[PDB]
Structures are given as structure tokens and as C-alpha cells.
Amino acid sequence: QKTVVVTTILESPYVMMKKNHEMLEGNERYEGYCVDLAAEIAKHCGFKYKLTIVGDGKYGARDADTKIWNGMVGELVYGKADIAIAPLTITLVREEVIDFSKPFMSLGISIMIKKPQKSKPGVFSFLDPLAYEIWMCIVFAYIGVSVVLFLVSRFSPYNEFGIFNSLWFSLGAFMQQGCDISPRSLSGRIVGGVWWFFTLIIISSYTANLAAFLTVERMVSPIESAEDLSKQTEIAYGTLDSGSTKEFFRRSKIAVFDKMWTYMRSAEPSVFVRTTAEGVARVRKSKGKYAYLLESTMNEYIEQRKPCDTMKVGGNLDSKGYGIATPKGSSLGTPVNLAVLKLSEQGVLDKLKNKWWYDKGECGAEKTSALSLSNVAGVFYILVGGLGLAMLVALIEFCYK
Amino acid sequence: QKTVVVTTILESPYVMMKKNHEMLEGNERYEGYCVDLAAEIAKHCGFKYKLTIVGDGKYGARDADTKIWNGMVGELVYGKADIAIAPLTITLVREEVIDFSKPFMSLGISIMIKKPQKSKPGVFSFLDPLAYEIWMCIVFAYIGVSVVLFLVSRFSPNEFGIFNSLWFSLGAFMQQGCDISPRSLSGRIVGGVWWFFTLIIISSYTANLAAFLTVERMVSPIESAEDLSKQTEIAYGTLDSGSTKEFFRRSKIAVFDKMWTYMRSAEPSVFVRTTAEGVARVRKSKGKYAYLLESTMNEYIEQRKPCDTMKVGGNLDSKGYGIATPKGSSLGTPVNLAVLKLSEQGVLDKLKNKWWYDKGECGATSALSLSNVAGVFYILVGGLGLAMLVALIEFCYKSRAGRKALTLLSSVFAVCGLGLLGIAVSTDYWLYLEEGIILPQNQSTEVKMSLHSGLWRVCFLAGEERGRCFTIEYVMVNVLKMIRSATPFPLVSLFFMFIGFILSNIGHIRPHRTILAFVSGIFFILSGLSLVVGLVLYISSINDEMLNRTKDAETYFNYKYGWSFAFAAISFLLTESAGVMSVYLFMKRYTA
Amino acid sequence: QKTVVVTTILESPYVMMKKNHEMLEGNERYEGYCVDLAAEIAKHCGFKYKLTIVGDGKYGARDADTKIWNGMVGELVYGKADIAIAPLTITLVREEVIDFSKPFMSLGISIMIKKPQKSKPGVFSFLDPLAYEIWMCIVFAYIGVSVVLFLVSRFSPYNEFGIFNSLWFSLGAFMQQGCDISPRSLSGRIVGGVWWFFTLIIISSYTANLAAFLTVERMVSPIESAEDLSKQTEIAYGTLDSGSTKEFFRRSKIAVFDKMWTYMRSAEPSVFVRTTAEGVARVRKSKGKYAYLLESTMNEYIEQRKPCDTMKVGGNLDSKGYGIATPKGSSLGTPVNLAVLKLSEQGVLDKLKNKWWYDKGECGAEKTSALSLSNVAGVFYILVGGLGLAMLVALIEFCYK
Amino acid sequence: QKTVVVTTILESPYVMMKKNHEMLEGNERYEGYCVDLAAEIAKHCGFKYKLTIVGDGKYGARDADTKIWNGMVGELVYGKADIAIAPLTITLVREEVIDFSKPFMSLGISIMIKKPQKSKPGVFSFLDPLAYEIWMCIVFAYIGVSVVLFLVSRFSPNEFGIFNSLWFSLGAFMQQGCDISPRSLSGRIVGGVWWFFTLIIISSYTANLAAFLTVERMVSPIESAEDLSKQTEIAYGTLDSGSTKEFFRRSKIAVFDKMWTYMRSAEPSVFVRTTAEGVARVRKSKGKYAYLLESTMNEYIEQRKPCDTMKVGGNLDSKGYGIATPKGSSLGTPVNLAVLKLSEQGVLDKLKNKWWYDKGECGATSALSLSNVAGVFYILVGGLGLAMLVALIEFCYKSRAGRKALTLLSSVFAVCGLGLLGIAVSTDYWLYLEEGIILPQNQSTEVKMSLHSGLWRVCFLAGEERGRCFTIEYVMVNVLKMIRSATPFPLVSLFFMFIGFILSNIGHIRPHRTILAFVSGIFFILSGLSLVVGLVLYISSINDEMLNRTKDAETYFNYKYGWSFAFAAISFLLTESAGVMSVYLFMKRYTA
Ligand code: NA
Ligand code: NA
């Protein structure tokens, strides 16, 4: 009848070279999202098509001097193609020269951080089953029950409870140990037994909350939005050195993306990578201190690669669309536009996206280990620090003995 | 030229009537997203426009018989409108008759759930790993061990009084073992079993609290449609007429086919008929309902007071709102170039932040908190306050300063002790018990059956309000036969108490010998320990049959104790006190 | 062309009367498995059918005196029907007079027990975090460390450790309490500290295993097979008073079903119910002490009703089949036989069974409570029994003082 | 009449050749289910038969081009056979060309998994809630607290020796607090922090053991295809050619469509090509592979030695094996009546129990077991045996029976102590570390990189076997910079030890004054406590970077310590012993 020269670009999962492409020939050399999409457009619009990768290898832009269009846009304007079933972003400068359909895929700028791991434990990590409000109120109560036991014994007599001895009865009461002497007045018996019931609940609450932490691994991200990235300075963030994503933050005006751009423009060292593969490798080799601002479709795809190291957080920052382009004044413009809206409402576009991102995507969708010395290392430090601060006070003691 | 007739629909925050709607006139009667969007398009395309609200109040659909469009799509096809700057979904059946621009807003089907919003701990929530019958019977065990300590020691070859025996049982309970040790083998049996008792109780407290804190960390909130698909404790529903309901019936996606399966067969009806109804059902369900709606409404209602609902997960499909034109218009091409310019100049994100978020009525650690354990501080502050109270009266006792009041308190506690157990075992109020069904609206209860209970006499109440006091000897369950096993121990308790009373009386009538006072002291203690065996049997019989109920989500039981149960608890404290009083003056007869 | 009079019986989920059957009329009065099956047979074999419930209301049997066939078999033999798309069991006596197809549903005799619940706690239920082998070895070791501490102190002297005192040091060491006096020889210091490390592990093992039990509810059934039912006598089991299931155990000869029949024949009271609804209600109102031996298709269906009270355990005891019956010498015999094998291999028969048993089936496919007094009641009993056995030995003591 | 030609296939346990196959001849060459079934059918139908094995060795299928059946279905259509008494599946394409009887065996697709078979606890598995570096550093903390107890007390205004100081730290560690109390405020700081130390350690032991026992109760075995569908840690596969593989590709059932999705895209290939291969992959995977096969093979292989695999769940579909006839035979109707008679007389269940189970090579509590805690009994029996050992030498010491050997042991421990730490910090064996990949077959390892390590000198090894001893000052990670932070504390430990040594020497050269012996005693204890800060920093630096690894299922790390790490541990025990020795003879100089 006539052959239709379609044009796409080499980009996963849209068009990939199949494993046996040196022995296959025709439209069977290539596989991917746009290969399956071109098959669906052809069966609805009724044409025979020839898959053809763009020679220039770009998407399409107009030179500011020669006014000549590069990429897949250039093959439609000048005549080398009949349709571009490809991830072309529907933009203002391209709609003036070629005709887009409705967006078969909606996307935007997203955040790629490294997938969060357990943590490194600090020194006072052993205190974390109880909040700092609790630990300070225990110290306040330990001074509290010792001052009262001093006033219970010295005033209203029955002795052997000084300000140093009342701290020493209540201390072994806390860690459930044995003391030298017991109170013998009923006022002192209340100070004993009620503080005994206090530390019984606190030790049990410490052990039970630590058992919940060691059983259920509940990892969180520091970043859940670009509002979170703007407020912080610990995690660095950047875009690619040339493209629509860096140009988005350059001319943005809202509240946050201006704040994010003044960060990225100023920051030393350079947050701007030069390749997408450089920005993904910089996320993995930064131990969770670099976030790469890129498109949501690549962000969901790289998250389904190996290793399982990157993560998409938050929502999109803008709203773009990928359209199927035809030359202006073409006989394919209207039926392909009606074909995209038919495939969208039937679930075909959702089905092909679940296939090439999740079904054909690796890393789809324990056995508690021993506690390392890192988790309880601060308890050794207070212990030896307690042994060091006891040899000093004994040396302070024989300065006046 | 002429004025372009802009047809829109009344929908918030797209087109809203202003507050001064009656006084102010023209195109200035209206505010919203699409009113600001119509000004941006007319500025770039270069026309003067008039805003009109569609008469039908619909978006647009063709009749299956009449084939006439009824809405904003109808006014474009039939010539009444020149443009529809409106939240109009770009649809296959609509694109055949009108021309859409590129989407000015990308959107889809989302999930609306109620925020968990918290679980608030009370004052004595630290007691919650054990039931209140355990904490009651621990105190009965604490008094019971101490008086047996006093009995076994100061009659034997003292250091142990009841002041020291209450002190040994404290340090053993909170695992201190502070210092005092029973020396005879008979005293060591008391210390032995009370050491094993508190070893189980502290282990049961820690392990049940570890169970509670672990299960609430297993609670995963809904973050996808797969989460709604699996979890069936949250019911989810759609509006009864619209594109969101029609999405699930035709979907050939595995998770979405299962969700329509759940919704088409669910009792009662999960399909609301109004968006305001579906938002209301989210709020009056305490996180047990999830409403599937449009994402732009889900983001807008989340920013309205009350700040109660939230948007979870992503979108379930991808569709867009477009600017629509008569399909033969000379305006459709500059409008299409206008929307793509406003998308790239950030005007559309600026206007969405304005109406959804800037005019939003809302805003925008895993450790144990201090509110979880604030009550054990309150006992501790309360303990130090009570200790300063005794410090006055003990300093007063030494500064200011026999068997007579000791004789008197032994009798008068045994008088009230024999009386309170007697009127408790006779009267029938030992167990309240309600039954019924949970009505869906407001969880309003209806008691299908109340009860009264004694030991050999139950009586029914308001639910079937009959005065028919059924004897347990013959009528008509098994839990009334389980308390028959519990029944003899308060009877033996009253029997040991009476013999201890009459020997306490003739010890006061005839104080000639001494030994009959100690025989009284044995009998009050054995009567109290028989009450502990009785009350633990009585409560354990109830909790076993509360478990054997075939638990349902439409039944409820509200078992309760009464003043007949309470006077038996008072009967314990008085006879164990009169047991301390009886061994006291028996030592005075040896002394004097 | 001609109308086909099909015959079925009123039985869920096979043919049920639809909710609006008084206003609907035709083949739309009825719904169910066999209603959807008759629609699938008609679209493959090409006929128009009339749904007709059997007047007699039975499945079909031959009278031993009149030799006349009842039920749906009788309407095919004498002429009142053209096909019986129904759950008819393919048997020897029916195949001689009518023609069955291949089995569209395979089934057998199964076991219906009540769905297991938590338990009722006994008296020594508090001991259950540790096995009885552990508890006896602790008592052996407590006597062991007390006899050794006696020989450590009396032989090889340094006293205050008799046979009663050495039991008393090791006792408070077990429950982590304070004792009156400590050992003062290095041999006694080893007996102290090593038994101290013993009870530290045992108390921690008790608390941790109890925390695992209270967190993960893992309920089990006493019965997992008919081999389990034969060996026990606690749970009673029976069949219906008349039918194929009772006749199966009557003439069985293998090993176990003869043992099960001698049980059921002898047992008092009667294990044989007279209705299926009586046997299901007897399972629910027996608190897990009655098992009802019935067909696997009703057992899976009643399990998906309300309440969620019954459970199917084990596998099938025999192997039966439900076939679609035609009269002998019929023009529908061969195409319906080829229709059943076509619907089986396409998944239609599996799809209709998932619909009417699981998708149209209710009861498809936490928040830890406080411990009741029932769980720890035996600890109170040993305590008061310890208080009772101490007042007695003190009374034994003053018989020789 | 003629002899009926029975065509069967060689398949166990349906038709098997006997052991005496060479000598015995006729129809008696064969045994099995279908040999017994052919005898039962010929007895009821009344014919004499001859058993033949099919030449092709196939069941039967038509070619897509040639349209010729190749198997037992082929010998029936083409006249070579009169009946096929065989495990022949009743199929739609087969029923068109031959006549099947009713199914003599009902069957389907099942799941074959490996039995868990146990997890066996070792001797010292009770130590496993804490790492062995914790249990090592507890003993270092136990020695460290005791020697500081002795230092702080017997130099001050004794009850405390090192014999009593090791005893106070025992009762505090196992939470007894048996009886002795430090009286001065300086001694109470030692008792204070060691009470808080063991409060965290016992709580960490109990909570981690509660985590372990809870997670292993969360382990649910596979009991359905829905369990295989959800859980992706067990890989499941089919045979590469057969009806079971063709079942999943055409299935429109939601759980079965997802299983084919997992199997069509999985690396490496889950599809085996032989049934014997698929059973083998179940056995060499330790419960990480599940083979989807025929139910009758799954029940038969389960009864074969080794008793290693099991059948879980129910069947995934419903099909049957039938007796097949030429479609124009006068034998098909009595055979159909024969199979229904043998089904009801229990003959078919008798023959299945015979070959599957009666000739089967196999057979056919939730509490903590005594094997989990047997090691703490072994310490306890070991403790009582060690206590009787000291009972001899303490009875010997009293029966038989100064500063000189006390002077000698103080020196010679400080000589070896200064030497062992010196040669440890200099040499580079502090950390072995292996890296590599896990080969699939036999889990055979290959070390891609070994390491040596010191404090300022690492050296590579066999994986890229280079002798290039990289200095840490400049080369080329961060964990080598983390041990740089650890580095000064063994250097200060050696610095405190040398000053303590030379003051110990001139105290022996010049015993004129006394005070320089105690200054020696301070320096050995502070050197040992600096080693505790050093070794805890050194180990915690390693375990933090072991966590930051981006954990994969194809990588493995096998970090290990060496004799350079071990001599620093020995350097602790000797200087803390020489610290006890130094304060001992300083008290002898006061005494004498
Ligand atoms: Na203690
Ligand atoms: Na837990």
C-alpha cells in the first residue's frame, strides 16, 4: 500500500536491541515499550511500518544559528519519517512545527536517593528504646527519691542515710541489686518500695521496646519531598549539566525550586553530573548523601535494575507528557491521536508499562542476627569512663587524707 | 470582534461564586482555578470573553437512544459555546465530537483514607499488659504472703513483724531481696513460693508488653491499591455513578479486577451516591473505610477543615483535563499553544498551588514516649508525698509518747468481716453481663440481654426485662456450673471465719488461758487464703467462657462485677487484718 | 429448532433461586454453578435450553421392588428430560441406564471440624515456655548445686551451709534475689557464680519464648487426617444416617475406614445425624469435639459461609466425580462429552468454581490484648499452696518443740 | 477368541520390569499398578491379554504438519493396539480419536518442596543473641571492674581484695548483689556503672532472643500456590516440555497468571528438562526451590529414599487417567463398567496404597527444647567439677601450711606484657578479610580478595596475590581511616605500660621508699583500661562498615582476627594481673 517509516531512539525500556539482533532482521531486531506501542498503533490505524533508529541519535532541537532541527523532530519536519512513536516530550517549540498526540505517558521530575539501610550506631544508641524525656525524668527522680530519703531519715528520725548513702540505696534499687542497709521507718519503707516498683516498669519497658525494634525492621528515608531537600544541607542534590531538568530549576519561580537552584548554582563541589549513568553511580557511591533529580520514568526503571540500591521518593515536581509525533499536515495525525486515547482507556498503555518496568523488571515487589559490639559500645565507654573517674576521685581523696 | 462564550461548571476550586456574588456582577461573580485559567488563555490568544455556567450542570455524555450530548460537551457541539475552559476529561467518545487541547492538569484515581491521628495513652496505661483482676489479686497475694510470714515467724523461735513482713514481700515482688531472710524451714517455704510467683508475673508483664509493641510495629498503613487488595479489614468503595466506578468493571489488570470483585459483592453497600457522602463515610469509620475518587478532589478535600483525611499511594490510572473547542473552531490551535506555554512558564503549577494549597485550610521516632509511662511517675511522686505524710506522724509519735484497743480492733473487724461476707454470698450481684449487637451508625448499642448473678441464684434484667430469678439447681449454662465449682470456697471462708470469731469472743469472755487466741489467729488467715482460692477460681471461670464465644464483629460482651463481689474483697482485708490483730494480743498474753 | 429440557436440583452453589425470582421469568429465575455451566454447554453444543428443577427433588435411585427410577435419573430414563446438567455422582448403577460425560468436578469424602481457637489454659500452663525436660533438669541441678555446696563447705572447710542452707542459697540465686550469707571459699565462689550464670540464661529464655508465643498466634488442629481420627477417641466423628458416605464406611475394607466404621456403628450417643444442616450445627456446637464426614464440595462451601467456624482438614477419602447425564442413545451424548473436556482444559470449570465458592463466598482468604488471670492462675495456686504448706510444717515443728 | 494387545509405557510405579526380568518371560516380565489393573479388568471383562510396551515411548500427540499420533494413542488409532491400560490423561484432543473410560485415578498439578528437616543447635548456641566480641569484652569488663575495685578500696580506708572484687562483679553481672557494698564514694562509682552495664546487657540478651524466637514463629511453610505467588525467596519452576508448562501459559486464573509471569522472566532458568533433574534441584537447594509436577509422581517420589521431599497444598487443576480404546471397539463399554466397579469395590484405592505406600521406602510443641540450652548445663556441670578441683587444693593449703615471688611475678608479667603488645602493634595481622562471589553449584567459594591489616600497614593476599603492602598514610578505604581513630589507644596503652614497668624495676632496684610501687600499680591498670577503649573502638569500626555494604545474595564477607589481635587481648590480662601484683607488694611495704 505504502510503508510507514517510524522513528524511535535507543533508550531502555522504549527501544532496546534484542539479544539475537544480528541474526534477526526487520522489525524483529528491536524490542521494548515503543516497539510494542508501534504494533498497537498499526493494528488500530491499519498500516505497515518499518522501525528505524534516528541516525543523529537525539530527540530534537532547533539550532539558534542555522535554524535546522536535529533528532527525531528533524526527520519529521524535512521528510525522512512519517511518524515518531517515541518518548518525545510535548513542548511548546516542537508543537509549532510537528503534531503531537495525547500523552501516552505522563511523567515529571523526581528524586532518586539511595535505598535506606539499617544505620550506623552511635555512642548513646543504647539509650534509644526510651526517649530523652524519660531518661532525664529518671535522673530527676533519682535525685528526687534521694533528697526525700535524706529528709525522711535526718529529719523525723528513727542515721545511716546521708546525701551520699541515699544516692547509694536508690542506685542499686534502679539496676535491681543488693544494698548494704534498708530503711527502718515506714516513711523510708515507702521510698524504698515505690521506687522499686518504678524501676521494675522502666527496665521492662526498655527490654520490651528493644525487642520490638530488633524484631521489626522499619527503615525510613530522611527525604520524602523536595520540601525536605530544600530545608536540609546534609544531603547534596543536583541535576544533569544540560537538559530540561536543569533548565526547569533555572527559570522556576514558585517557592522551593528557586531555593533549590540557588543551592545547586552555588554549591562546591559540582552537583551537576554530565551523564545519567554518572548521576546514578554518584547516588550509590555517596552512602546516602546524594540525591539525583531526574525524570520519573527513568527513576522507576533504574529502581527495578540491579542492584536494589536506588529509590524514588515523593511525587513529581512538574508535569510532562510523552507524545507520538507526526509531521504537520499528515494523514496519520488524527487516527493515531484517536488510537492513543483508545489504548489508554482499555488499559493497554498501563499493561505495557507494567510489563517493561515491573514484569520484565528484576528486583521485584530476616533471620535475626547477633547484636554486634557497635550497638552496645557506648555502655563500655561509660563503664571504663566510670573506672577512670573512680581512680581520679580516689586520687582527689588522698590530697586531703 | 465578538465575545467568546466560555462555558464552565460549578466545581470547587475550579469555579466558585464569590462572597459578594449578589452585589458584584459580570465575569467578576466567579473565582477559582478555571477563572484564573480563562484569564491566562484570553491574555495570550487575545480575545474578550464572557463566563457562563452550564444549564444542565453536567460535563457531557451522549444518550444511548437519543444520541444528544447533555452538558458542556453539548453546548460546544450544538453551537451555544465557543470554548469550555473547565475540568473536562479528555475522553475517546468526546474527542470524536470536539477538539481538546493538551492536558493542563494530569490526574487519576486515588485513595482517601482517614488519618490514624493517634492512640492516646491514659494515666494508668502502664498497667495494661496485665488485666485488672491480676493487679487486684497480686495485692491479695501480697497481703496474704505477709500475714503468713508474720504467723509463721513470731509464733516460732523475732525480727519479723507485719511491718517487716510487708517489707520482705515488697523487695521480693520488685526483685530486690533487700535484706531479711527467714531462718526456719517453715518460713523459707513462704519466701520460696513468693519468689517464684513474682518471677512469673514480671516475665508475663515484659513478654505481653513485648507482644503489644511488636504487633503495633507490624501495622502497615495503606500505601497502594495492592494494600487495599490484600487487607480486607478496611472496606473500600466508589461512587455509584461515574467514570471511577466504570474503571473497575472493565479493568483487565490483576489487582484492579480483584478490587471490583470485592466491591460488587460486599454487604452492606460500599458504593456511596455522592462525593460528600463518601468523604463522610471516611470520617465516621475510624480508619475502616477508604474512598476511591478523583485525585484532584482528594488533594483538595485533604486541605479543607477538618484536617482528617489524607491521600495515600499514587494514581491508579492516567487521564487529563483539557480545554475543549467546537471541532470546527479557529480558536483551538492558539489555545493549544497557550496551554503548552502556561505549562512551561509554571503558571499552571502556580495556580494549582494557589487554590489547593495557598488557600488551604490545613497547614503544609520509634522510641517509647513519656506519656506511655507517666503514671508510674505519678505513683512515684505520690509515693514521696505519702512518705512525707508518715514522716510527720512518726516524728509526732516519738515526741508525744496497748492491749485494750488491740482487743477491741480484733473483735470489731471480725464483726464486720463476718457480716460483709455473709450478705455478699447471700445476695445476687456478683456478675453483671450484657449482650447485644453493634448498630453501624454511631456504634449505638442495644442490650439484648442483661444479667444478675450470685452463687446459686441468677436473675435476668432489661433485655427481655423478666423478673424470673432462675435458680442454678434446675433451669433451661455451663459457666453457671463453673462457678458452682467456685461456690464452696467462700462457704468454707465463712465457716473458718465464724469459728475464729467465737473463739475470739470466748477468749475475751474467758481470758484464763492463752492458747485459744492463737487458734483464732489461724482461722482468720485460713479464711482469707480460702477467699483467694475462691476469687481466683471465680474470675478464671469467667475468662475461660469469655474466650469460648466464637468471636464476631457484630457481638459485644460487657461483663462486670458488683457490690457482692466487692464485699468479698473487703472480707479478705478485714480478716487478714483481724488475723494480725489476733496474733498480736496472743503475744501480749505471753509477754504480760 | 427444538427446546432442550435440562434438569437440575435445588442445591447451593449449583442452582440457587435468585433474589428477584418472583419478577424474573425463564432461565433468569435461577443462578449458580450449574446455571453458568448450562450456559457454557449450550454455546458449545449449539442448542436452546429450558431450566427445570426436578419435581421429585432427589438425585436418582432405583426402587428395589417397583424397579422405577426416582429423581433426575428417572426423568432421563422415561423421557421427561433431555439432559441433566447437575451434580450427579457417576456411579455403577446409573451408568447402566444413562450416559455420563467426563467429570466436570472431582470430589470425595472429607472431614469437617470446628475451626481451632486459642485454647483454654490449664493450671501448669505457665510452665509451657520451657519444655518438661528443661524443668526437670533444673530441679535436678538445684538439688545438684545444693549437694555440692554442702560438700564444698562441710568437707574441705574454710560452716553456715547445711543441707537446708545450701538449698536456700541456690534458691534465691534462681529467682535472682538476695541471700543471707555468701560462700567464702573459692570452691563455693564457683558454685555461686556459675549457677548465677545458669539462671540468667533460663529466665531470659523463659521471657523471650513467652514473648514469641504472645506475638505470633500459631493455632493447630488435633486432626490432620482420617489416620488421626482413627487413633483418637476424644473427638467423635460420624456421617449422615442415609447416603453414600455412610455406605462407603459400611463396605470399606482397607485398614482405617473399617476401624472408623466399627467406632461409628458402636458409639453411644448417635454420631449419625439425619440432615447436613444438623451435622454442621453439631460441629459448631460441640466446642471442637465433633467431626462431620461429608463431601468435599459442600465442605469447601460451608467453610466459606458465615460464621467462620468450620474447617476442612486432610485430603479426600475416596475419589468421586460429578458428570452431566444424558439418556442412553441420545444425540447430545457425544457433543456434551466433548464440551466438558473443552471447558476443563480452558480453565472455565476452574473459573466457575473460584467464582461460586470463593469470589461469591463470604469469609474470604491481632492487637494483642492483656493477659487474663487464667494464664497465670496456677502460679497463685502454688503460692497459696506454699503458704498452706508452711503453716503446716510450722505446726509440725511445734509437735517436737 | 484372540488375545487382546495391551499397550502400556514404562513408568514407575505403573509398569516396572521385575528383578528376574531376564529369566522370567511373558506377561510376568512386568509389575506395577497398571499390570495389576490389567489383571482386574481382564478378570471382569473376560479376556486373555498380552502386555506390550509402546515402541515410541510416548503417551501420544498429533503432529501439527504430519497429523500422525506418536505413542499409545497412535497404536490405538492405527490398529496396533486393542486397549491402553496406562496412565493416559483424558484429553480433549485425544477423546476425538479414541474412547476413554471413566477416570481410574484423579490427579492434578502439585508442589514439591524440600522438607525443612530441622535447624540443629550447637553446644554454645545460648551465646548467640550476642556476638562473640560482646562476650569477649564482657570478660574484659569483668576483669577491668574487679581490679579497679581492688585499687580503689584496699588503698583507701579492708574487706575488698581481688578475691572479693571478682565476687562483687559476679553477683552484679548475674543480678544477685549477694552481699558486699563499697563504702567510700569512690568505690560506689565503680559499683554504680557496673550495675548499669549489666542492666543493659541482660536486657539486650533477652530482647534479641525474643526477636529471634518471634521471627522463626513468623516462618510459614508453603501450603498453596498463593504462598508461592507471594513469597519470592523460593524460586519455582516446571519441566521444559509438557502439559504442566502449557497449563500456566494459557491460564486466565489470577494466581496462575502471576506464577507464569514469574517463571517466564527469571534468571537463571527455572525450567528443568527432566523430572529427575527437577527432583534433584529441590534437594540441592535447602528449601529454596519448589518443583511443579504431577501429583502422582509427587506422592511417589515422596515415598522413595532419600525421604527428603514432600507434597504441599492441594492440586492446581483436576484431570484424570483413563483406560483407552480404539473408538470402534466392542471392548470399551465392558471396560467402562469395569472401572466403575473397581472404584466402588475399593480395588483402585487398594492398588494405589500397595504401590505408592505399602511398597514405600519411607514410613507412614512450640516449647523451648533441652538442646537449645544444653550448654549452660555443661558450664554448670563444668562449674561443679571445677569447684571440686579447688576444694582439693584449698584443703591442701590449710593442711600443709611471700613478697619474694610476689616481687617476681610483678616483673615477669610486665616483661611479657610489654613484649606482647609491642610485637602486636608492630606486626600486621589484626584483620583477615575475604571477598568473593557465591557460585550456584555446591555453594563453592572463590576468594576475589583477601587482606592483611595492622594499624598503619595493610597487605593484600591470594585474590590478586600481590605483595604490595599498602601504607595507610597514602594509597589508592574509609574503614582503614576508622581504625586510625582506634590506633592511638594501643599506643597510649604501651606508653602507660612502659612507665609502669620502669617504676616497677627501680622499685626493685631501690626499695628505699614505698610510694613508687603504687604509682606502678596505677599505670598497669590505666594501660589495660586504655586497651578496652581501644579494642571496643577497633571492633565497632569494623561492624559499622560491615553494615554499610549494600547487602547482596551473591556477595560474602568473612572478616576474621589474627594473632596480632589475640596478643593485645593477652596484653590486657597480664597487665591487669601485674596491676594486682603491684598493689599487693605495696601493701606488703606498709605491713612490714
Ligand atoms: Na536482685
Ligand atoms: Na517480640
Author numbering:
A (entry chain B), C (entry chain D): 392 to 549, 569 to 775, 782 to 817
B (entry chain C), D (entry chain A): 392 to 548, 569 to 775, 784 to 820, 833 to 907, 919 to 1034
Reproduce text from the manuscript describing this model.
Synaptic complexes of α-amino-3-hydroxy-5-methyl-4-isoxazolepropionic acid (AMPA) receptors (AMPARs) with auxiliary subunits mediate most excitatory neurotransmission and can be targeted to treat neuropsychiatric and neurological disorders, including epilepsy. Here we present cryogenic-electron microscopy structures of rat GluA2 AMPAR complexes with inhibitory mouse γ5 and potentiating human cornichon-2 (CNIH2) auxiliary subunits. The core of each complex is a Y-shaped tetrameric AMPAR with a three-layer domain organization.
To gain insight into the structural mechanism of PMP inhibition in the presence of γ5 and CNIH2, we supplemented the purified protein with 100 µM ZK and 100 µM PMP and subjected it to cryo-EM. The first group produced a 3D reconstruction with density for two γ5 subunits per AMPAR tetramer and yielded a GluA2–γ5ZK-PMP structure, grossly similar to the GluA2–γ5ZK structure published previously. Because of the much higher resolution of GluA2–γ5ZK-PMP compared to GluA2PMP, the positions and orientations of PMP molecules in the GluA2–γ5ZK-PMP binding pockets were determined unambiguously. The pockets are mainly hydrophobic, mostly enclosed within individual GluA2 protomers and contributed by residues P512, S516, F517, D519, P520, Y616, N619, L620, F623 and L624 of one subunit and S615 of the neighboring subunit. Consistent with the critical role of S516, F517, P520, S615 and F623 in PMP binding, alanine substitutions of these residues caused a substantial weakening of the PMP inhibitory potency. Crosslinking of C589 cysteines was not observed in the GluA2–γ5ZK-PMP structure or in the absence of PMP (GluA2–γ5–CNIH2ZK-SPD), indicating that CNIH2 and PMP together are the two factors that cause strong deviation of the AMPAR inner pore from the fourfold rotational symmetry, likely due to increased protein flexibility in this region. We identified four PMP binding sites in the ion channel extracellular collar, a hub for regulation of iGluR gating. Given the substantial remodeling of the extracellular collar sites upon channel opening due to kinking of the pore-lining M3 helices, PMP acts as a wedge that binds to these sites in the closed state and prevents channel opening.
